[PDB]
Design a binder for this molecule. Structure first.
Ligand code: FPS
Ligand code: FPS
Ligand code: MG
Ligand code: MG
Ligand code: MG
Length: 284
């Protein structure tokens, strides 16, 4: 095993550790493509944890600096200040693919501003936040999962990631409340007459369910639109991308089955992921 192989294997470990939902799915891709995804994931994961988990704001500045170094001198050797193995894998990927560097910068700014967390006043603010933390990952992942780097591709990728961030939000309402975060907007929260602190203490009710179902309906609808343009992706990636999404559509059925509980984190069982994959491949 070469050194670079080792760098990608460290990225793989990080994704296996933190992505209980998607590691399984993305590892089904051909080697070159899944190695790039592990790199991207590891970069995004370090960024998202820089502050949330290590509290470390200097570390986040170093990640930005490191990405900035790769963008300007893709071919020079750099003394990476954040995590060397991840940045080497990322520079290796940038020498073969067209990395949307601005998208990592948008993600970094969105993760940063999340330390001045202020509830969204409207859905448009919530949706612009889904772009920043997940539409951007769709954009950076675009040249890896497709040979047609065109606006329709970027656009389905962006729309898929924002859509998964919404499902994510619907799965994590309760744990996000414990961390003092409510991602639903005030406009919509007032309109459905819900106070999350309250529903958290006394259980679900019918206003909360309707609020939640109002957002799940937005996510499901968007899921179906990207499932009609799944062909913008490479042929090897299409069933994986579809598996990734459906796992998350599954999580919504899991929240419904646990009666929208705010006190547990529903997940999808590995065995079930393999089933979903089997069905997708039926028509693939
Ligand atoms: C493929 C494509 C074109 C677009 C999709 C872009 C993606 C994958 C965006 C990320 C969406 C989110 C919120 C993922 C959870 S990461 P996690 O590791 O925390 O997952 P988990 O919390 O275990 O469910
Ligand atoms: C899967 C893939 C290709 C890309 C994802 C890249 C990542 C990790 C981006 C950082 C922003 C996200 C989606 C964090 C997890 S949201 P959460 O509710 O799961 O909270 P968490 O940080 O996981 O505890
Ligand atoms: Mg997670
Ligand atoms: Mg996080
Ligand atoms: Mg969450």
């Amino acid at each position: 095993m070469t050194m670079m192989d080792m760098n990608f294997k460290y990225c793989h470990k990080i994704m296996k550790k933190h992505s209980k939902s998607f590691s399984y799915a993305f590892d089904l891709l051909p080697e070159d493509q899944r190695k790039a995804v592990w790199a991207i994931y590891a970069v995004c994961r370090k960024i998202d944890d820089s502050i949330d988990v290590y509290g470390d704001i200097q570390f986040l500045n170093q990640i930005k600096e490191d990405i900035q170094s790769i963008e300007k001198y893709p071919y020079e050797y750099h003394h990476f200040q954040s995590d060397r193995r991840i940045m080497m894998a990322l520079q290796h990927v940038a020498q073969h693919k067209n990395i949307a560097f601005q998208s990592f910068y948008n993600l970094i700014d969105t993760v940063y501003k999340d330390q001045h967390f202020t509830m969204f006043e409207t859905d448009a603010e919530l949706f612009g936040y889904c772009y920043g933390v997940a539409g951007t990952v769709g954009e950076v992942l675009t040249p890896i999962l497709s040979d047609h780097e065109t606006h329709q591709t970027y656009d389905v990728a962006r729309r898929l990631g924002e859509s998964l961030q919404l499902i994510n939000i619907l799965r994590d309402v309760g744990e996000d409340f414990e961390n003092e975060r409510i991602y639903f907007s005030k406009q919509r929260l007032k309109q459905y007459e819900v106070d999350i602190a309250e529903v958290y203490q006394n259980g679900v009710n019918n206003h909360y369910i309707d609020l939640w179902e109002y957002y799940a309906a937005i996510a499901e609808k968007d899921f179906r639109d990207v499932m009609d343009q799944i062909k913008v992706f490479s042929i090897e990636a299409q069933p994986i991308i579809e598996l990734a999404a459906r796992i998350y559509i599954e999580i919504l059925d899991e929240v419904r089955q646990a009666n929208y509980t705010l006190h547990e984190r529903v997940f999808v069982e590995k065995r079930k992921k393999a089933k979903l994959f089997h069905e997708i491949n039926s028509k693939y």
